[PDB]
Nucleic acid binder design. Structure first.
Ligand code: FES
Ligand SMILES: [Mg+2]
Ligand SMILES: [Mg+2]
Ligand SMILES: [Mg+2]
Ligand SMILES: [Mg+2]
Lengths: 96, 85, 72, 122, 48, 109, 99, 137
RNA sequence: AAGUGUACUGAGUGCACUUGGAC
RNA sequence: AAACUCAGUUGACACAAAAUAGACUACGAAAGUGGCUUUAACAUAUCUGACACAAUAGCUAAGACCCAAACUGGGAACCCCACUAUGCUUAGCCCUAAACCUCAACAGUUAAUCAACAAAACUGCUCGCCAGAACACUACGAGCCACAGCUUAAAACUCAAA
């Protein structure tokens, strides 16, 4: 009929979802070097999702991994282990 | 059963113990430990704790929305570009 | 429109470049518009593969002299 | 199914540790497990002091006995590890590789909070 | 295909025949599971 | 009234403890406010917290503004701590009684 | 909601007004306005867009018809008789440059 | 080298020293700051009691104990005792939230002991003893 | 602060629950 | 004040409770469920529809008893001190909560809004429930009890209100 009729199609300009830094990467309860990144250096308190910038699934996975490591003796409970202080800062925190 | 002095320890810089203590207290407040201590001085019944947490979440969201609205509409405060009309 | 796919891919591959939009000229045609036209004529030729159409359109416009600067 | 036994052993000499590991694998086989593989994460200082068998230790050797066993064998394995003295601490978990890595497209968008306030004409 | 791969793996499992040799080899060796992640999702394997 | 006096003492201690930390706010904590006393209205309609003023006028104004902005949050924190089941609105009042003594001693010197 | 029939579609979450419908509606509206002008009725241009207040006032003065772009006192039409006088003649047609 | 606020790692070759003594070796000044008392104990790295002080010891009675001046006096007395014992540097570790929490350190410094590290050890129970119900007035 | 259930005491208290209250 | 001669560090150390995550809103029919591991495991037609459960409290027998705490006692109902039932485990009972999202299940709709407030308004379909207030979560009888209580539940008299 008329070739200029707008067509029914999905958005091509839509951008892919912002994958969380851990999305598609398997969290493990033995990767203390990783879990340390998501706990408070001075107290060992687990950072909330509003600080870790992680989706619900991976936030829960990190929480469970941290608890499992702590109870099984892989991770200190009351502090980020000093060996991992130089690791990249992946939590939006402004102590200083 | 942990190692001592690794938790909640701050090294004083040049002896400004006041500044170091302020930093330590800031750390405690940021991690909420002071909240926990002063709340655990007495026992909040589970019903009261649930009500308080719901109220806190509602107030947090309301404040966030109000601040966002204020920031969004602040730009219009610019002097009137059509004065005299 | 069907050409929206081409526009999206061109923006992804080369960005907005430098030929800023002169929105006042109704007959204005940008680099993305030129790419869309060349893609359409290439498809009409008989070539049907999408990726081949895209790459050959880029090369053809390069030959035409278009500075198809790559965004990334 | 496929289990992983994380084992923290009292830090001590090579012949001793080999004997303890052999005894543990013997216990697993008696309990019917098909020991898959043995891994060693080395010795290191325990994150926090752990007491066991009228004693406390600060350094331990970490190992991961991956195996397959009938479900019933797990309780017996736990009891055996608890009774053993050379084991600072033994835990048994469902082997992580068993769980499938369900793929997430990413972070889904966050709309306005779900009906946290009324819709009436107010 | 799954069972075929499993068959291959079983040849490398632990048996009483190779029990002691495998135990000693594991003792000599050392596996590592630690690795951090940057802000951009880059795995940073730790040098030993 | 003895009950009112006890309430004033408890509220003074609680407010001092609150201000000891950034719990209310880092901005408030940095100001290092010192409370002179606490007085409850006879009907329990208000709680006046008398805070000592500094010499700097701009500092006094800023401290007053921050205190007024944080009074409600402090009230909520108290009622959450259960230091008092019900706390009336908190009003921060400047205290300047010590200025007379200070300037006396200055002149007498 | 009520502008859905007139909206041609959405382009990147921006509505596009169907210019065919706009052309028909503008034809009808201009025709009606011209008819009222020919019948010598009173046409009043109303709009509270301060960006175009000056332009609208000048256009009204040029065309002879009247304009009201400033703040709209309550009842300037409902209570027109008391606000203006018993014999006041009310506008025979209004044109909302901004509704 | 740029300063750091984390404590030195025990069993690590840290060039930092104080009169040649290593951080772990430095005596520890426990400070318990309760609601109605403040107690200080400087103890050797082997936790040998080197000096002890409190508001009760300094004589402040009942309410007067919970005062910054009382805490300062306790700190000064403990500092004098520790100095007589031969102490110079001290690692301050504090628990509780008593009013003399900072005045104790103030008095200790005024008495002449160099605080090298301020540490907290507040007994925060994850979940244990159920606390008593809330007062009411 | 109010109230529901429940129990002691002689209106309060104890435990849990609800906001049909305030922050 | 009363009370203890006990207090601080360090070490050992639970049959109690389960920071942070949790700003998440998931599981379960409901009550409820937020320490870790393992096992078992989360009914169903592709509709609705009376034996089994039922928080806290309470009782029986035996254990545990850090801490908290009706009651008691002491100190100057409310405040402070100590302590008991009880909160806990086992094995049995009782079956009531503002047991509430105070909004029954299932299917469907957004077409024309509607006492008011509350959680926008409705349609179909089924079961349960109500016919002014108080008398009255009461009496009588009955069931459960195993005797001090719960469930069921009235009447008379009164009023023009509630
Ligand atoms: S965003 Fe995909 S797993 Fe976290
Ligand atoms: Mg049915
Ligand atoms: Mg039923
Ligand atoms: Mg029950
Ligand atoms: Mg008891």
């Amino acid at each position: 009929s008329n070739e200029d009729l707008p067509i029914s199609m999905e958005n091509p300009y839509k951008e892919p979802l912002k994958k969380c830094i851990l999305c598609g990467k398997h969290v493990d309860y033995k990767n203390v070097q990783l879990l340390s990144q998501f706990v408070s250096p001075f107290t060992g308190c687990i950072y909330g999702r509003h600080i870790t910038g992680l989706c619900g699934k991976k936030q829960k996975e990190i929480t469970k991994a941290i608890k499992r490591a702590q109870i099984m003796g892989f991770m200190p409970v009351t502090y980020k282990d000093p060996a991992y202080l130089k690791d990249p800062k992946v939590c939006n925190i402004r102590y200083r | 059963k942990h190692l001592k002095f690794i938790a909640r320890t701050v090294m004083v810089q040049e002896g400004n113990v006041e500044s170091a203590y302020r930093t330590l207290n800031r750390i405690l407040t940021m991690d909420g430990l002071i909240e926990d201590i002063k709340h655990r001085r007495y026992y909040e019944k589970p019903c009261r704790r649930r009500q308080r947490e719901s109220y806190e979440r509602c107030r947090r969201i309301y404040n966030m929305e109000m601040a966002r609205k204020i920031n969004f509409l602040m730009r219009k405060n610019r002097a009137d570009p059509w004065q005299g009309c | 429109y069907h050409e929206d796919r081409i526009r999206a891919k061109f923006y992804s591959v080369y960005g907005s470049g430098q030929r800023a939009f002169d929105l006042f000229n109704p007959n204005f045609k940008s680099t993305c518009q030129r790419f869309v036209e060349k893609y359409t004529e290439l498809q009409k030729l008989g070539e049907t593969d999408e990726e081949k159409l895209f790459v050959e359109t880029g090369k053809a416009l390069l030959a035409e002299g278009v500075i198809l600067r790559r965004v990334g | 199914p496929r289990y992983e036994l994380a084992l923290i052993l009292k830090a001590m000499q090579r012949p001793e540790t080999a004997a303890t590991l052999k005894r543990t694998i013997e216990a697993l086989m008696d309990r019917g497990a098909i020991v898959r593989d043995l891994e060693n994460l080395g010795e290191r200082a325990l994150p926090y002091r752990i007491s066991a068998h009228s004693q406390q230790h600060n350094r331990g050797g970490y190992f991961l006995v991956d195996f397959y066993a009938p479900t019933a064998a797990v309780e017996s394995m736990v009891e055996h590890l608890s009774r053993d003295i050379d084991v600072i601490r033994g835990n048994i978990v469902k082997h992580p590789l068993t769980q499938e890595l369900k793929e997430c497209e990413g972070i889904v968008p966050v709309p306005l909070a779900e009906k946290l306030y009324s819709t009436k004409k107010r | 295909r799954e069972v075929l791969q499993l068959q291959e793996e079983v040849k490398n499992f632990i048996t009483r025949e190779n029990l002691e040799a495998r135990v000693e080899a594991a003792l000599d060796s050392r596996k590592n599971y630690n690795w951090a992640i940057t802000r951009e999702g880059l795995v940073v394997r730790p040098q030993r | 009234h003895a009950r009112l006096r006890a309430l004033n003492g408890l509220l003074y201690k609680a407010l001092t403890d609150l201000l000891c930390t950034p719990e209310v706010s880092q901005e408030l904590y940095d100001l290092n406010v010192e409370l002179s006393k606490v007085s409850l209205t006879p009907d329990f309609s208000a709680c006046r917290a008398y805070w000592k003023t500094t010499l700097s006028a701009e500092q006094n104004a800023h401290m007053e503004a921050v205190l007024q902005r944080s009074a409600a949050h402090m009230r909520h924190l108290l009622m959450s701590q259960q230091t008092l089941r019900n706390v009336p609105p908190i009003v921060f009042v400047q205290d300047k009684g010590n200025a007379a003594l200070a300037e006396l001693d200055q002149l007498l010197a | 909601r009520f502008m859905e029939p007139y909206i041609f579609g959405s382009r990147l979450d921006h509505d596009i007004i169907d210019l065919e419908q706009t052309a028909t509606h503008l034809q009808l509206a201009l025709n009606f306005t011209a008819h009222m002008a020919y019948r010598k009725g009173i046409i009043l241009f109303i709009s509270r867009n301060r960006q175009f207040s000056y332009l609208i006032e000048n256009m009204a003065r040029d065309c002879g018809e009247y304009a009201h772009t400033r703040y709209f006192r309550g009842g300037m039409l409902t209570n027109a008789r008391l606000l203006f006088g018993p014999t006041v003649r009310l506008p025979d047609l209004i044109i909302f440059l901004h509704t | 080298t740029k300063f750091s606020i984390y404590p030195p790692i025990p069993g690590e070759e840290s060039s930092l020293r104080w009169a040649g003594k290593k951080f772990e070796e430095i005596p520890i000044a426990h400070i318990k700051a309760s609601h109605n008392n403040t107690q200080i104990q400087v103890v050797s790295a082997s936790n040998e009691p080197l000096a002890f002080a409190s508001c009760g010891t300094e004589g402040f009675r009942n309410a007067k104990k919970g005062t910054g001046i009382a805490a300062q006096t306790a700190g000064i007395a403990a500092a004098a005792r520790a100095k007589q014992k031969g102490v110079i540097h001290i690692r301050v570790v504090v628990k509780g939230l008593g009013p003399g929490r900072l005045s104790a350190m103030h008095g200790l410094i005024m008495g002449g002991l160099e605080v090298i590290s301020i540490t907290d050890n507040t007994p925060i129970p994850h979940n244990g003893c159920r606390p008593r119900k809330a007062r009411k007035l």
